[PDB]
């Protein structure tokens, strides 16, 4: 039924014989590898992954209070926030959004798709459940679009409930406008900034950052050369201890002199300028930027004057040189990151199709689902767990000026890059590979009938259902275990030597919850779910289990482990924006597929284009106008 008779039926079904049937793989030599691995893979992947959940959560119960304490590491030594009841509330509102999605979806769409004809002669073939709803003629293909709109309206709504709970605390009057003007001179800005009827306080023209580097280095070096002069019961190997005073020398000589040599050069460098025009005229000036004091308009501050940044934040270090140099750096960084995305996604996609190439081979040779549907999705989960961090490092090396801005950009970029990898790259690559497969299966010499009717995805959508299942199970497992972390803790304390240091380590492993990266992970998976939902119904049921198992793993993690944190209220709103993005990406994938298939000028695709266009437009309004 699932491993025995299973293959038998598929092996010998259709065999041409199309009095009227469309099947898809009708032109088959008995069978074709392009058919599909059993039920899609969902059976074997679920078992292998639910086993893994039940392994990882059985290697947590054992390690919680053992392994030093990487379980409760926060309930140990010196409730969880208000910026956590918000994250948990987002999670809850998404649980309910997806419960509704699941219900509606499953019911309506599973029936709609199952009433198909293509990919239907096969009994068990994830495909019958996906979009194998004929092409035209099936009027039901309109339903998909009308249900997609139900999903955007639903997510606008359920997210609004969430945003009617995250109380923007009447925050941002920061009378400190910035600038980006010409080098040289200062009091001329202490003339034009005055304009007329304006009460400035100060100016301060930004300079450089070599000093900043040395300082932090010297302070950390100081930490070393001071504290590590103890060792053999002295005071803040043995040969290293006898060279630690020379390393202390290094700090107090090289770096020290170096420090002072930077003030030597401070005045030399010149960049832009902040200004402390206080009161409320800030607005006036920021709005103007204009003419007023033309006497003092050599450089006309022909550069942006952009409110403030609040001294605490402004990464003085990264005031590169603005303009050209900064954006080129940005370009470089983002492009390397994109080529990396390509690399990872490629490996996983090709593992997944490394059987369905020669499309003339019998369905026998389709590779066990655990080398086409588990291993691929696990590698993608894995390489999509490095992305959170590589994106962080990238953000740093882009010289983002404002530090809060850097935090939010980190959130948005983890989102973009993750969404990308998973959803997008696989979708594009797989759909392209299927166009390819359907060329090579519908070669038939000059019959260029690459029936773009059955070109959905190589596995008919299973790659992503399996990514979601994988995620849910294995990932909630690994967020509960946080294996990489237990490993560090362990070793850090295996070489703790003294129990003083032990205490130190335990009193240190207690990261404040990063409600930035986590919002993003959750939302990348929510995006996969919603996007493929109306076009691969089964993903939602196996996705409510993701968010239900993440509300659960986070109500553990955000209490037992992970320290209380407080974030800019902006990070919660970026999440709401990203879920709205998920439903719009769903409408967009419905479009892409109704364009590959179903032509490009038929009612179906046109309806979905209309909605897509309108939605992108109203969204643009709320971005610009508001
Ligand atoms: C008590 C101690 C004993 C523990 C026993 C239990 C052992 C496990 C048993 C069961 C669960 C199985 C887990 C497998 C996934 C491993 C990932 C990993 O650990 O690293 C990390 C991710 O990933 C990486 O950083 C490296 C990834 C490289 C690829 C290797 C993947 C393995 C498959 C290769 C196939 C070869 C090619 C196949 C060719 C056909 C995990 O980190 P994280 O959880 O993502 O958390 C950080 C980020 N996050 C929180 C934001 C998400």
Numbering used by the authors: 9 to 86, 131 to 224, 232 to 295, 320 to 372, 382 to 718
What does the paper say about this structure?
Mechanosensitive (MS) ion channels are a ubiquitous type of molecular force sensor sensing forces from the surrounding bilayer. Briefly, the central cavity created by the dimer interface couples each subunit and modulates dimeric OSCA/TMEM63 channel mechanosensitivity through the modulating lipids while the cytosolic side of the pore is gated by a plug lipid that prevents the ion permeation.
Like AtOSCA1.113, the putative narrow pore of hTMEM63A is formed by the M3, M4, M5, M6, and M7 helices, which is a typical hourglass-like pore. The tightest point along the permeation pathway in the hTMEM63A pore occurs around the conserved hydrophobic residues F555, F556, and Y559 on M6, with the narrowest section of the pore being less than 2 Å. Interestingly, we found a lipid-like density that plugged the cytosolic entrance of the pore at the intersection of M4 and M6. The coordinating residues of hTMEM63A that interacted with the putative phosphate of the lipid were W473 on M4, E571 on M6, and W613 on M7, while hydrophobic residues on M0 and M4 interact with the acyl chain. In the monomeric hTMEM63A channel, we identified a putative analogous pore lipid that plugs the cytosolic side of the permeation pathway drawing clear parallels with MscS and TRAAK.
